[PDB]
Structure formats: structure tokens, C-alpha cells
Design a protein around this motif. Structure first.
Motif, PDB file in Angstrom:
ATOM      1  N   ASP A  39      -3.370  11.268   3.150  1.00 15.25           N
ATOM      2  CA  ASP A  39      -3.919   9.990   2.723  1.00 15.25           C
ATOM      3  C   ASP A  39      -3.187   8.825   3.377  1.00 15.25           C
ATOM      4  OD1 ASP A  39      -5.578  11.440   1.065  1.00 15.25           O
ATOM      5  OD2 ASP A  39      -5.207  10.201  -0.720  1.00 15.25           O
ATOM      6  N   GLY A  71       0.836  -1.185   0.000  1.00 22.54           N
ATOM      7  CA  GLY A  71       0.000   0.000   0.000  1.00 22.54           C
ATOM      8  C   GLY A  71       0.874   1.238   0.000  1.00 22.54           C
ATOM      9  N   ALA A  72       0.304   2.373  -0.380  1.00 17.90           N
ATOM     10  CA  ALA A  72       1.077   3.606  -0.421  1.00 17.90           C
ATOM     11  C   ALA A  72       0.309   4.825   0.079  1.00 17.90           C
ATOM     12  CB  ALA A  72       1.573   3.857  -1.851  1.00 17.90           C
ATOM     13  N   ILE A  85       4.984   2.950   8.746  1.00 16.49           N
ATOM     14  CA  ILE A  85       5.474   3.207   7.392  1.00 16.49           C
ATOM     15  C   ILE A  85       6.877   2.619   7.241  1.00 16.49           C
ATOM     16  CG2 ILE A  85       6.145   4.961   5.732  1.00 16.49           C
ATOM     17  CD1 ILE A  85       3.053   4.532   6.421  1.00 16.49           C
ATOM     18  N   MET A 114      -7.572  -6.479   0.823  1.00 19.62           N
ATOM     19  CA  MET A 114      -6.161  -6.170   1.022  1.00 19.62           C
ATOM     20  C   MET A 114      -6.084  -4.696   1.398  1.00 19.62           C
ATOM     21  SD  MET A 114      -2.841  -6.662  -1.507  1.00 19.62           S
ATOM     22  CE  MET A 114      -2.715  -5.064  -2.310  1.00 19.62           C
ATOM     23  N   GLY A 163       4.660  -3.994   3.440  1.00 13.05           N
ATOM     24  CA  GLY A 163       3.872  -3.054   4.212  1.00 13.05           C
ATOM     25  C   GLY A 163       3.531  -1.778   3.476  1.00 13.05           C
ATOM     26  N   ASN A 164       3.344  -0.703   4.234  1.00 12.07           N
ATOM     27  CA  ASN A 164       2.985   0.594   3.676  1.00 12.07           C
ATOM     28  C   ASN A 164       4.187   1.469   3.352  1.00 12.07           C
ATOM     29  OD1 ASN A 164      -0.201   2.032   4.881  1.00 12.07           O
ATOM     30  ND2 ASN A 164       0.453   1.295   2.865  1.00 12.07           N
ATOM     31  N   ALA A 205      -3.097   4.837   3.581  1.00  8.86           N
ATOM     32  CA  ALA A 205      -3.589   3.646   2.904  1.00  8.86           C
ATOM     33  C   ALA A 205      -3.913   2.591   3.956  1.00  8.86           C
ATOM     34  CB  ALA A 205      -2.545   3.125   1.930  1.00  8.86           C
ATOM     35  N   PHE A 211      -0.260  -8.344   5.404  1.00 11.58           N
ATOM     36  CA  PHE A 211       0.067  -9.200   4.272  1.00 11.58           C
ATOM     37  C   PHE A 211      -0.029 -10.697   4.546  1.00 11.58           C
ATOM     38  CE2 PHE A 211       3.252 -11.755   1.978  1.00 11.58           C
ATOM     39  CZ  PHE A 211       2.658 -11.730   0.719  1.00 11.58           C
ATOM     40  N   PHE A 232      -3.859  10.687  10.486  1.00 11.22           N
ATOM     41  CA  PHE A 232      -2.723  10.943   9.609  1.00 11.22           C
ATOM     42  C   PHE A 232      -2.486  12.384   9.168  1.00 11.22           C
ATOM     43  CE2 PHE A 232       0.007   8.937   6.171  1.00 11.22           C
ATOM     44  CZ  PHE A 232       0.811   8.254   7.086  1.00 11.22           C
ATOM     45  N   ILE A 267      -4.540  -0.731   5.011  1.00 14.31           N
ATOM     46  CA  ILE A 267      -4.334  -2.075   4.466  1.00 14.31           C
ATOM     47  C   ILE A 267      -4.344  -3.176   5.517  1.00 14.31           C
ATOM     48  CG2 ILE A 267      -2.975  -1.222   2.514  1.00 14.31           C
ATOM     49  CD1 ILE A 267      -0.452  -2.046   4.060  1.00 14.31           C
ATOM     50  N   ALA A 268      -4.586  -4.400   5.059  1.00 16.79           N
ATOM     51  CA  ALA A 268      -4.610  -5.578   5.921  1.00 16.79           C
ATOM     52  C   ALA A 268      -3.177  -6.054   6.171  1.00 16.79           C
ATOM     53  CB  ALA A 268      -5.404  -6.689   5.238  1.00 16.79           C
TER      54      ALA A 268
END
Ligand SMILES: O=c1[nH]cnc2c1ncn2[C@@H]1O[C@H](CO)[C@@H](O)[C@H]1O
Ligand SMILES: O=c1[nH]cnc2c1ncn2[C@@H]1O[C@H](CO)[C@@H](O)[C@H]1O
Ligand SMILES: O=c1[nH]cnc2c1ncn2[C@@H]1O[C@H](CO)[C@@H](O)[C@H]1O
Ligand SMILES: O=c1[nH]cnc2c1ncn2[C@@H]1O[C@H](CO)[C@@H](O)[C@H]1O
Ligand SMILES: O=c1[nH]cnc2c1ncn2[C@@H]1O[C@H](CO)[C@@H](O)[C@H]1O
Ligand SMILES: O=c1[nH]cnc2c1ncn2[C@@H]1O[C@H](CO)[C@@H](O)[C@H]1O
Lengths: 237, 237, 237, 237, 237, 237
Positions: free
Chosen positions: C124, B108-109, B175, C107, B151-152, C126, C131, C120, C128-129
């Protein structure tokens, strides 16, 4: 040396001309500068320094987009003592009276980027050029028998935007040209206390476009560089 | 030919590897590709197409920043039939347990850019990679005896951000690396229905950094490209 | 105990499955867990603990919406030592190539909520779950002869949206299903350092309002649960 | 007449000077215009018309704030044929190198108002003055032996801000003065196709709360007015 | 004396009625107040103090727009001991079932301004009036036999909005009247600790386009005033 | 029958009391309603219908969070003829001069949620209750000798907020209680045309950290209920 510019203080003039296309940098050095020498090659972003009518000048590309040009203008200003940045590029027009090859000067730059809001506590920052640089470019163009249009530019983050209705809004508010860096450079200049100006030539009409010859393009391009260089000398007086 | 890619349908493989630095493109073609041929040179953004273990592959740089890479990935997808885009770059880490030269995979980003909000009616769009591409890269790395962290990532518009407190927020949310394109490529892939993945190596630690040798850097870089290329073959099976 | 969970450290397993409906949790404990015991009943949000193939597992409802589920997941993680959370629910389809009784794995999760922006710094994030959890679920489904889809979900705050334009937007960017809490759960997982995953079966499809329980819908719901339970087993290894 | 101006086409000149204080407009008509006549008095917003060195000129107050001045300028432009608007007011200094009785010309105006975002689809619109009017003012000031500053002004909605952090922000980005309507006037000028310019004298300085009328402050205010009036003369040529 | 009010503590009563129009304040003083003296005329913003039924009452205009009234209400509250402020203005109707000259009581005020977001950390602050004050006005109105609807007002920054579609959104959500101060006055009352209420007379219709004339203005405006003055007396008892 | 309520038009009264807790609805039915029958238990969201002083009244939980109550209030209003909804919940105090077990009447509700911005074109919609309903509650309370403050509530999306500083902003602006539904219920009432009011019992203090216990809960919660039921009767007369 900085992360993107492998050079030392003094290698760059206090005035730097910056095209988008990295290839135009060596062209300007060969075509307009005297005693030019290479001062940067990191990531292939070729940098040069020479003189014009005795005046020390540097030229180097900034890449497409606000993020890219923000990196270079910032480093030049904080690490190489650069005081004036003149972007010389191209743009697309949304106004019917704005013609292909017209020379436009961006006194101000609108944008859909979030960089200046991030800088200005989410408020509206009027990214503007240095007034004297603007008048110098205008006076230099008239001397060369070219009438430059002065006004607002729009710096788009997305060259291929999902919403085309924004173009009508731009036309409605008098936007002279659509490019991708001006607002970023103006933000950097304000943040680190330097001066900046963006000069562009209309390369296309985002709507009912036509066509130009390669000879026409170089002539216009050489005209813009001449205006930029002569504007610097005027600024010096 | 498109505005930034002077080529025709078929010149690019359906899979394109993209480094930030344009110079790395020919290095990958010479070092890892067989029967490579040049397919682009506009603005000096050198593009190549050859094969790896018989598989057709292309490599070309995207420039620094979301706007720049948005242009190239978009054109490749809509005009050259490209189906998979693998960015291979570098990033800075904010987590203490993330070490220099670690290989990270951005499932993800996150970002501070406004491009996806502009796309997603000002809501939160989770810019994510293709899941299979992620698992392929992970499986390819393990095969090469490398443990990739998944990860992110965070895609910054400003390499030199005015507010450093954001780095603590990034660390607090896990992050893995700070770079500048991932979120843009993920947005493009979703918009035009293609697949994308970003793989990065930790080149610095945005805080208490250390140093690496040039030999160390090339080894790590060659490791990342190997992972990317082998991940493609896995994806093919 | 916590303000919303009347239990003590130990009452829950380090893995918790969570449907939105409190009654679904009782159904799950009753159908798949052995030696099940109710460990919570505050506000009627039934939570149970038992074992699956000798593995200690818990299941508790989380109500509807991000605000609701974020309260429960947060308390489970910081007060009951819970390490993994797997939301098992239903979602509405937006893509035509996606039909009922289809297992979707999130995901990533997009959202129109402001909770992650508040976390945040208005940027933005992200959502996410984890991995590994995604991979374990993908592999469990495969072992059950099920072909699950892995992509983006959309977490909405309004089940009854005041503007249906967003569904075309979601479809355009490939969102697989619309539910109401995945983005919130992924956000608390990131904020408090835990792992999470959302699995959904397509209840209805905006592409023609149709959704009618049946033996095959109930069969598909049980498959999702088996995938959830079997995926934790793989993770344990 | 319009809902806020009880006059008819012809009553105003195609050029209008506008102070915020209705009483300042009467003072101006009385001090610099010959053959002056009141052409409006609705809500007490006195407007006058007369001639300066044989040139027909008008002067009318616009009240405080963007909401107020945008009503008047809009009506003047679309209903009274007004082509140029020159706001002549006062501003608070934020930069230390800027002291009282200093003439500032707003080439651009930043703002914390939402009016331009509402106009520009939530994007950044650079609210700028008309280049020619700026140049005419710069040249008139020079002819009067005055060295005016040309830069960014900041238009605030709250004269009494609930957070003084923004002043450090303004200073950092070089804002020359803080007033309350330049950004709104530039926005209506762009929306209805007219030309505008804001000139200000520094009333007080946040860098030490000090501002006390005197013969030299009144002398400086009159100089600003002479610059405004003489600049329109240059434009006529 | 404050920056915009040349008076001293005690010149104003603890209660102040405020129309946007200075000339209307004058008319209220002469028509409803006994022994009314002028206590301010800076920038022509006429302020008066006299008695009604032996009760000391003040009346002063506040100009058009949130920025203008924010200045005056703040100075009155912090430097003149004013405890209650009652805005007596006009507004436009959006609902078809709201006739011209009707009286509206703003229990709440929506807005497109950013002032309250700046005060409330960019969140939603419900700008509401003081309950007792609203109740006093409703009873006072009944005691006079005058009709008065209680609800939401919408405070617009632009009297000439470039977005007419928003009028549909206002109508949909039951907005009673469109004016330009309420939300700002309520924000100030809450920021500086005072109490406020806005009463309005529907002077026009956004839709039908009818503008106040005849003797309908007098009686209706005098009805609004009778309610305000009387509601005050009830407040005292 | 609606998606979340298994009942038919007529099973619910035109007025409905709603605590967030289903078990509390059950308790209200058994303790205050005569001949109370269960009319729904989907997802365990217990709903009841009976009489009070011979008046038909319904009571049903709505769960925690704006997304949850938005579903239930909408379905009741559009498919069961419900005209008035009274939320009877608990909240946290931010002001020092607000004691535990105190009764608050939400005339308005601030929020950090985005639901109303989505409804109101991203502008500020003041979420307010129905005036008459508020008035009925205040009188009903006086008739019972119970104290009740009327003001703003703050509807938070996160019960566990990562931003504690905002509590200072709430206190500063006089927020009476922090809960999680009011602003959403008011948005729905306005969107679908019904009337709403939220009454709350201060169950805790954000600051001091005191949690409801003893027999203070019973009597205080029964006081909140007496006010709601009685305010309804006054509404009928
Ligand atoms: O029509 C146009 N739209 C946006 N940017 C343009 C246009 N024409 C020239 N540029 C400029 O050229 C590069 C992109 O090709 C960018 O550097 C931008 O500044
Ligand atoms: O520390 C870092 N911060 C931000 N971007 C980085 C960093 N390290 C590598 N990149 C990556 O390298 C280029 C910028 O030099 C960008 O292309 C970005 O993706
Ligand atoms: O079409 C749909 N839109 C939004 N949420 C849905 C949909 N289908 C299932 N859910 C899911 O079911 C509950 C609401 O009934 C929510 O918990 C949501 O996650
Ligand atoms: O320090 C200042 N801050 C904000 N506006 C100012 C300041 N000084 C002068 N003005 C200007 O004067 C009026 C308010 O008194 C406003 O019209 C504004 O433009
Ligand atoms: O239709 C209307 N729209 C906006 N404001 C209005 C309207 N009618 C009356 N006012 C009110 O009158 C002044 C502007 O003339 C402003 O003070 C505003 O509150
Ligand atoms: O301190 C508090 N903060 C936020 N919501 C609260 C608080 N106290 C009571 N509630 C209310 O109780 C439920 C959550 O337990 C939510 O329904 C909310 O409205």
C-alpha cells in the motif's frame, strides 16, 4: 541486549512461556516458578527465569497482535538461543460445541494478516505448531484430567473487524478459537528454525455469550499454565 | 468500560496523546500535565488525564503494531468520545538527508499490512492524517524553532522483514520514516469518523546509522511532546 | 520534443495547471493568462504558456484516466523541467454533507488502479499531494473568501463501474470526491521527484443524480482556477 | 453412483486409502487386503474394497493434482459415507537432512493453489490433517521400528514450475516434501466435515536429482502402507 | 521415456488428441485410428498411435485438472516432438441458449487457477488457442454440417465450487462452457512453444442439471472427434 | 446526448473505427469517407460519420488508456446502437521477429490493469476479440496482399513502466504488441454486449528504440485502415 530485550545470552531458558497480558508474566513466576529472577523490563515487558520441577523456564509477555509478538519471538530465538515458545492465552469461540473455559490447542493457525504471504512469495503457508509439542500438551492435559481440543485457530489482525460474515466462514471450517498471535509465532518459528505452540482458553463466545466468575477464570488460567509446564517436562522425556 | 479500557465516558479528554512505550505515558503526565489522574491500568496500559495550559488532555500507550493500536484507538473513539488522536513515537529513516533526531510529520502512511484492503474492498486506501492537525503541528514546531519535515511514513507489520530490498523502494519514493502504527490509526480514524496524526522522531537510520546520548534523546522526545501539545491549542483556535 | 509533446525545453513554465479537457486548457489560457502561446498540439492535447500577474505559467490538458495523465505529467517532469503540477478538474460527490460548487483539495487519493502497487512491490502506497502546495491552496482560497475541503479523493479506472457497492464504501471512509487521475499523478510525482496537487469542484452528486452547468457553476470553476493560480504565487514567496 | 464413481452406498468402507496412481491402488488391494473386490472403474480410477486383519478397508486412486483428488474425496465423503481419507503417495525432498526412503507425515500442507483462498474469503486457511490420525500414524510407525517425520508438505499445481526460486523458499521454511494434493484434500475435509491425513515416502530429492526404484524403495513404500493400515486399527480402538 | 510417459521419441505423432478420460482415448484409437498401437500406460494414462486417412495421429488421456494435463502436455512437447495438441473434452453449460451435446470451440479460456498468474508476474495473461487451429476446426465443422460456437471457456479448479454466484458472472460474460483444463493447456503451449485448441461437448448444464446418457453421447462425441481429426488434415494442406 | 458525446441516436453508424488519436480520426474521415460529417467534438474527441463503398461508417478517437476508451465505447454501445467497434492503433514490439510497420491482429489481450479482475470476481477473464471479426480482418488483409500476424496484445496502464523485466515475460509468452486499450475494449464489449477487434501498426520497438517517421507511417497506417474498412464489408456479406 536487543532493541526490545535488555539481557544477555543465557538469561532466558531455552523454553519460554508467553502470555499476551504483560501482567500475567510475574504472576506465573510467583505462582509456578522457583527461584525466579527478573531478566527484562524494557517497555515494561517484564521477563522472568526460574525453574519448575528442576527444569529451567522463562516467562514474558508478547503484547497484542502479530507484529508485536513477532518482534519478541524473533529476538528470543536469534539472540537468546530459545528453542521452544509456548504462547498461553485466551480466545473467542465460533463453534456452538466449544464452551467457555474449554482448553484449545492450535495445531494450525489461519489468518487474515499478510506476514506469511510476504514470507512465502504470496503463496499459502500452513502456519503450524511443532507436532511433538502438541502431543505433549495433549498428554499433559489428560494427565491433569482435562480434555484439550486440538485444531485450527484463526489469528485476526483486527479485533474489531469491519466484516462479521467472516465468522460464519470460520465456523463452517471448524475454527476452534479466534485470537491474534498464533499465525505470527508459527511463521517466526519456521523462519528461524525453532519450535512453537499456542494454547488458549475460551474466554468468550463471539455470538451467544454468557458469563464467568473471577474465581472460575483463575482456575482455568492456572490449569492452562499447568498443562503448558507439564507438557515441557514430557517433551524433555 | 471496554474490553481493554476500564473507564467510563468522560474519563478521557476529547484529545489523546499516544506513545508506543507504555512507560512514556506516566512520564508525559508528570512532566507536562497538571492535575493528572489515572484513568486506566488494564493490561498495564496506563492512562492519564490532566490539563495543559488549561486544556483537557489524556495520554496512554497503544502498544507496538497496527492490531494493538487499532484496538485502543477504536475503543477511545467509539466509547469515550475521543475526537483527536496524536501518536508520538519514533522511526527509522531511509533517506540520507533525514538525520537522527529530525522531527517528522506523517501526512500519509504507506503499509504492508492488509487491514485497509480488508476495509476498502481490496483497493488502495490512502491512509492520511487530518490536514488541520498536520498544519497545527507544523506551525507549533516553527514556533518552537524546530523545522518539521512533512511527508509519507511507512507502517511495517514486520520490524524484522525478510526482504530488505523494500527499503530501497521506500527511499526511492520519498518515505521519511519507518514505524509500525500510523497506517492503522489512520484507517481507524476514517472508519469511525475521528481525526488522527502521527509525529515521530528519527531514532535510527536503517542503513548507515550513528549514535545519540540519553540526554539528546530526552530533549528530542520532550520537543516532540511540546509540539504535539501546542499543536492541540492551535487547533483549538 | 517527446513522443506525446512536440515542444522544447523552455516552452513550459516550471509550474503547470492541468484540466482533463484539452478545450478547458484553451479556455483557461484565454481567460487568466496574459501573452499566451500554444506550445503543444500533438493528439489535440493543447498546452499553453503565458503569465499570471507577471509570473510565467503553463496550462495543458491531460486526457481522462490515470494511464493518460501519467504519460503527460511524466514527460513534463523529466523532459521539460516542470517542478509543480496542479490538476484542476471536477469530481462526483459521495458524502451528503458535500454539495455542488464546492472546492475540494486532494491531500490524498485512493484508487482501484494497480499502477501504484506495481510501483510499490504490491504493498500500500499512500498517494499524497505536496504538503506545501496544499497549504498554499488552502490559504489562497481563504483569501478569496472560499472555504475549501481538504481530504481524500478516489481515483477510479471505470467511470462506469460494474458494481455500485464501492460508493457506500467510499462514503463510509469519508472520501470527498470521485475523479479519475489524482492517484496516478501523485504516483508519478513520487517516482520522478516532483510536486503535485489536485483541486476539484463537485460536478455531480451520487446522492441524487444532479449536475447542470450555469453561471454559478462556471463562477465556481473560475474560483478554483484563481485558487490554483494564486496558490503558486504564495509558493513563490 | 456419482458422476465420477459408479458404485453405491456400502461399496466403500468408512476409511479410504488413496495413492495417486490407479495401478498403485490395485497393487495395494492385491498385496494387503483380503477378500478384495473392485467397486469402481470410471475413467480408469480403480477403487477396491476388502479387509485388513478383519477390518473393512478401501483403496482408490485419485489422479494427480488438487483438482482431481478434490473431486474424488468430496464424492466419497458426501455420497459414500466415508469418514477418513489417508493419502499415501510420494514427494520430492527439499531439505538436505531428508533422504530417500524416508516416511513423511503431513500435519500441514502449504500450497500455490487458489482453492483454499476461494473457500476462505481470500485469507490464509491453514490446511491441516486430523490430529488423531497423525498421532495414530506416528504410533504405528514407531511400532514398526520406523522413525517418521511430521511437518509441512507443499502442494504444487505445477509439477514443472516456471520458477525454481520457490524451492529455496520452501527449504528456508522447513517444508519436508513437495507433492500435489495434500492441501486440496485437507481443504475438502474441512469443507465437508471429514478427517484426512497425507503420508509420503521421499521419491526424489531436488538436492541432487536422484530417484531409482529398487527392492529397498519398494520395501519403504510397503512400510508406508502398513503404517497407513495399522494406524486405522489404532484409531478404531 | 519421461517421468510419466514410457515411450521414446517417434512413438507419438506430431499431433495429439487428448480427452481427459483414458478410456475415451482407447475408444478413439479403436474407432477412428488404423493400425493403432499402444505407446504408454503409465499410471493407466493410455496413449495410442495410428493413422487417419493415412495421416499419423496419436491420442492419449490427460486426466482431470490443470495440474494433471500440464504434466502430460509438457512432456509430449519437450520430449516427443509434439507440435499440436487438441483437447477433446466435455463441459457444462451456463448460458440458457446452449443445448446439451452442442459443440464449443475455445478460442479463449478464463480461469480461477493461479498457474498463469505465476507465469505472468501476477498479471492477466489471456489464455488463447492458435488462430489457424481454431479456423481449421470451424471449417472442418461446416464441412461436416455440424454446428459449433466459438468463444471463451472457463477452466475451474473445483468441480464442486463453494461459490455458485460465480456462475452468474460467467453467464454475464458469455462463457460457453465450464471445464477444467483449457487455460492450463494454453499456458503450457505458450510456455513451451507449441500450439493448442480445445473442443468441447456440452455434457451437462450447471443450471438445469441434465447428465449425458442415451446414444446422444456416442454420436455427439464422435462429431467432436470428426471435427478434430479433419481440422488436422486441413491444417496439413 | 451522453456525458461525453454530444450526438443523438442515429448520428453514428452501427460500426465504428477508433484510433486513440482524435486527429487521426479526422484524417480517416477526410481520406476514406465520403460525405463525412462531424457528429461530436466534446473534449476535442472528434467523431465522424460518412460512407465507404456506399456503406455508412463512423470514426472517432478514444484517447489513451483503458479508462478513456472504456468511457467512449460504453456510451457508443448503450446510447448510439453501435454493434461493432474496431480499434485501429499503434503499438510497440517486444519480439525481435516483428518489424516496424507490421500489422497485428489482437485475437486476445493480456493486461496489468485491474478492470477485468473487478468485473470477473478477481479471477482470470481472457479478454478476446470476436472470432468472425478476426477472420474478416485476416481475409481482408490477404485480399490486399498485406501481411498480418494474429495473436495476443498486452494492454499496459503505464506507458513508462517502472518494471522493464516484464518485457522479458511478454516476449517469452509471444506477445505481439504493447498498447494501452485492447483488454479494456474487450472487457466493455463483453460487459455491454457488443463485438470488438483491435488492429495495430507496430509504431516502435521497446528494445531497439525506433520511432515512426518518413512516409512509412502514411502507407502503413492506410494499410491498417484498408483492412478494417474492408473487413467490415466482408462482415456484411
Ligand atoms: O474474541 C477474541 N478475539 C480476538 N482475540 C481474542 C479474543 N479473546 C481473546 N483474544 C486474545 O486476547 C487479546 C485481545 O484481547 C489478543 O492477545 C488475543 O490473542
Ligand atoms: O526502525 C524502526 N522500524 C520500525 N519501527 C520503528 C523503528 N524505530 C522506531 N519504531 C517504532 O518503535 C516501535 C518498534 O521498536 C514501534 O512502535 C514503531 O512505531
Ligand atoms: O462522478 C464522477 N466519477 C468519476 N469521474 C468524474 C466524475 N465527475 C467528474 N469526474 C472527472 O471527470 C472526468 C470524467 O467525466 C474524469 O477526468 C474525472 O476526473
Ligand atoms: O518432486 C516432486 N514434485 C511434485 N510432486 C511430486 C514429486 N515427487 C512425487 N510427487 C507426487 O507424485 C505425483 C507427480 O509425479 C503427484 O501426485 C505428486 O503428489
Ligand atoms: O460441469 C462441469 N464443470 C467442470 N468441469 C466439467 C463439467 N462437465 C465436464 N467437465 C470436464 O469433465 C471433467 C470433470 O468431470 C474435467 O476434465 C472437466 O474438463
Ligand atoms: O510502446 C508502446 N507502449 C505502450 N503503448 C503504446 C506503444 N506504442 C504505441 N502505443 C499506443 O499509443 C498510445 C501511447 O502513445 C496508447 O494509446 C497505446 O495504445
Amino acid at each position: 541486549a536487543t532493541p526490545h530485550i535488555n539481557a544477555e545470552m543465557g538469561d532466558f531458558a531455552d523454553v519460554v512461556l508467553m502470555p499476551g497480558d504483560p501482567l500475567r508474566a510475574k504472576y506465573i513466576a510467583e505462582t509456578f516458578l522457583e527461584d525466579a529472577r527478573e531478566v527484562n523490563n524494557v517497555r515494561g515487558m517484564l521477563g522472568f527465569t526460574g525453574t519448575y520441577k528442576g527444569r529451567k523456564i522463562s516467562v514474558m509477555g508478547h503484547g497484542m497482535g502479530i507484529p508485536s509478538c513477532s518482534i519478541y519471538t524473533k529476538e528470543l530465538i536469534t539472540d537468546f538461543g530459545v528453542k521452544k515458545i509456548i504462547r498461553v492465552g485466551s480466545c473467542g469461540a465460533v463453534l456452538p460445541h466449544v464452551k467457555l473455559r474449554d482448553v484449545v490447542i492450535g495445531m494450525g493457525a489461519c489468518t487474515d494478516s499478510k506476514v506469511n504471504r510476504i514470507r512465502f512469495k504470496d503463496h499459502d503457508f500452513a502456519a503450524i505448531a511443532d507436532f511433538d509439542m502438541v502431543r505433549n500438551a495433549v498428554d499433559a492435559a489428560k494427565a491433569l484430567g482435562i480434555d484439550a481440543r486440538v485444531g485450527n485457530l484463526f489469528s485476526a489482525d483486527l479485533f474489531y473487524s469491519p466484516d462479521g460474515e467472516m465468522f460464519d466462514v470460520m465456523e463452517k471450517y471448524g475454527i476452534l478459537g479466534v485470537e491474534m498471535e498464533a499465525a505470527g509465532i508459527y511463521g517466526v518459528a519456521a523462519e528461524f528454525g525453532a519450535k512453537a505452540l499456542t494454547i488458549c482458553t475460551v474466554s468468550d463466545h463471539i455470538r451467544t455469550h454468557e458469563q464467568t466468575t473471577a474465581a472460575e477464570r483463575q482456575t482455568t488460567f492456572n490449569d492452562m499454565i499447568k498443562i503448558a509446564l507439564e507438557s515441557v517436562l514430557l517433551g524433555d522425556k
